[PDB]
Amino acid sequence: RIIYYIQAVIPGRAWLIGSNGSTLTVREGSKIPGYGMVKLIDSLQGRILTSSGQVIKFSQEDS
Amino acid sequence: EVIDKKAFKDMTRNLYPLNPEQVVKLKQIYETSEYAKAATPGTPPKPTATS
C-alpha cells in the first residue's frame, strides 16, 4: 500500500505526506486512502489513530 | 566553620530559589500554557485552493 507520515500536526488539522510525494490534510474524522478514517489526532505526541488500527507518526528520518 | 557552610546553604537557596529541576518545571509549564493559548478551538479550516 501507501505509507503516510505526519508532515506537521496542530490541534485539529494534520498535514501528512505519503510515499508518492502527495500531501493531504486531515481532521478529527477524515478519510485516508488505505488507512481508513481518522479516529484521533494526538498533536502533542505527533500521533494519529485511524479506524483500521494503523497509526500515523512523523517519519523516522524527519523527527 | 559550620556557620559558613549553613550560611552558604541559605545563601544559595536565597539566590536561586528555583532548583535546576524546578527551572525545567517552570519552562515546561510556560510552554504548555503557550501551547494552550495558541491552540485553535475546534478543527482549523482546511486550506483549499478552489476555482
Binding site: 490541534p11 478529527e28 484521533l40 489526532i41 494526538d42 498533536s43 502533542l44 505526541q45 | 504548555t32 501551547y35 494552550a36 491552540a39 478551538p41 475546534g42
Partner: peptide, 9 residues
C-alpha cells in the same frame, strides 16, 4: 472536538 493539551488520565 478534543484538544490534546487539556489531557488528563
Amino acid at each position: 472536538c478534543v484538544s490534546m493539551i487539556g489531557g488528563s488520565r
